[PDB]
Amino acid sequence: AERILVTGGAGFIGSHLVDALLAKGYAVRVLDDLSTGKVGNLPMGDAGLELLVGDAADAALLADAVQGCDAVVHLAAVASVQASVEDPVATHQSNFIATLRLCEAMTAAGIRRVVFASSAAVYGNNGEGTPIAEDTPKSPLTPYAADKLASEYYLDFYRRQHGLEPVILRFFNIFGPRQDPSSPYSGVISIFSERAKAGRPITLFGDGGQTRDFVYVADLVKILVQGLESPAPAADATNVGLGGVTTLNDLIGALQQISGKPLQVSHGATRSGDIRHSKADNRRLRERFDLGTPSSLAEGLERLYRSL
Amino acid sequence: ERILVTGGAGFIGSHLVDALLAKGYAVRVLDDLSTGKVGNLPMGDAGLELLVGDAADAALLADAVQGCDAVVHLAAVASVQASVEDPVATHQSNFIATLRLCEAMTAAGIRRVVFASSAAVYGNNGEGTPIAEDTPKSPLTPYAADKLASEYYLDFYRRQHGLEPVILRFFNIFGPRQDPSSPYSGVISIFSERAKAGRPITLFGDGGQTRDFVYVADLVKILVQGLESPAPAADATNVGLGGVTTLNDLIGALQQISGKPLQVSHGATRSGDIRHSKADNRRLRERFDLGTPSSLAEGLERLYRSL
Ligand SMILES: NC(=O)c1ccc[n+]([C@@H]2O[C@H](COP(=O)([O-])OP(=O)(O)OC[C@H]3O[C@@H](n4cnc5c(N)ncnc54)[C@H](O)[C@@H]3O)[C@@H](O)[C@H]2O)c1
């Protein structure tokens, strides 16, 4: 049976991927420093799961972690963009050095396939208000966004120089159960859903006309598995957005209706780094992956709410 | 008034150090002497202070920027091939040094930093075209990716912390003190050293390849202007002349300068080699005072006479 190394596997997206891989019969090895990930996210009783608690930028740890692994999904990163603005030096270790050290360890070990969580943040403000195609000029505005893009560039280098097979996925806005709502910079759906469940007010920054391309985590997991099992994945990046349009006001009304409870909306100012419109051009995604029928926003919110 | 020059002991840096001291600045050099040479510097000049260490060393940078009014950040492992062989080590020199410098400058309240980026950030894009600054990026090596990431971090510190970066993408610089000892040394330093020594040269390909060569003294004038301009633009500026020199042109000009015909061994074209590389230097012409740059023959003659 094949073993998948999942860096960041104890986190939001990672733990769902772990469940899905194990269910398909893979062995899984999680490498996670539990900075935001949680052991309670993992099915620790599954005989197919191994857990290594440590830093994904640690070369000695990666040399151990890759031994006996057949492929990698590289999800470890400090996901809070704001955290990278606060401390560029520390987050650069997690957001880029981990990628570089993983490439070195995979090349030594002879492992080719790595699926990488890049981000729509690499586009910055370019193409705003239009479906963003993958060849849109990049404009990373924070250390996080620059490290995700630099990670792409190094993965492509190891592909050409050393025969790595990277599957570069630029996530748009992923949501669903286990997304941690504890920070003011947690994903807005995790925050809004937590308040609605508790019956407490939410805070809307700006006028609510901002749009995002929301993706339910279960649909992202399908793509991640397919990137692991593809016979010859494309070299260049693929957006993971649906090409959908959801305003924050759309989201407020959908969530309120799902909770069946009234929802107080207090106001805050638009946050300084807030992009107003964000939507993916889904054409490469639809060409390269089988999305089937994705979850609509309502279906995804419902599953999230019904889990809390 | 004092200028920090990281990499000041190297080829471009030491020429800059000469120019800045000649203009009355005090000059502090930070260099690990990996490829820089103390013999490149005017030791014994009362205005020159040399620090030897790693430009990625946080504690050392903190001392180094203290009392400085501006910075020229030239320290890097210039060999693209060295970054291919050792991405981990060269990333410290080619990117981490930039990030640490940003942090040290912010803490000390120093705004102006002139940065040596590279035409390598374009990859093969714009082959056969005047390369404008918005030409799509495609860094092919760790070195090129680190130069581009350096640019992005410099822009973030500008917006978030009031830094004033002057981002310059160098095309093919040449001149005295350019090390010809490596096979991946610049073709002009190699061809000239072999011409002076009367030894054969090796031409990879047909010699129709073209490059936008820039004499080091003209680059130095731009570096100094970047320090002294009152309100520099935020985005990158290509440093090239928009010139077109073939390798066969270069061989002919060296044969005319040396007075003896060069024996030309034929090698196969290098894998991935860009055939035609030319800057669109409109932004340079607009933002800087270029005067009359040295022609290739002028630069070659000045180089050859120095060997
Ligand atoms: N959720 C989104 O909308 C979104 C959008 C774009 C990109 N991403 C990327 O997707 C990946 C997963 O993000 P997530 O939403 O599940 O958030 P998350 O915080 O739940 O997952 C991050 C995980 O990585 C781990 N981690 C962090 N630094 C580490 C280190 N140095 N060593 C080892 N483990 C480390 C954390 O403990 C956590 O388990 C990340 O790379 C993130 O940047 C997510």
Ligand SMILES: NC(=O)c1ccc[n+]([C@@H]2O[C@H](COP(=O)([O-])OP(=O)(O)OC[C@H]3O[C@@H](n4cnc5c(N)ncnc54)[C@H](O)[C@@H]3O)[C@@H](O)[C@H]2O)c1
């Ligand atoms: N045509 C060109 O020469 C060219 C083209 C594009 C970019 N550049 C850039 O211009 C700058 C100068 O290059 P150069 O041609 O003068 O080469 P160089 O090797 O002569 O100068 C580089 C200097 O940096 C120093 N250095 C290297 N790593 C260091 C570290 N970790 N800490 C401190 N000092 C360190 C070296 O000792 C040397 O003195 C570099 O940033 C290079 O990447 C040059």
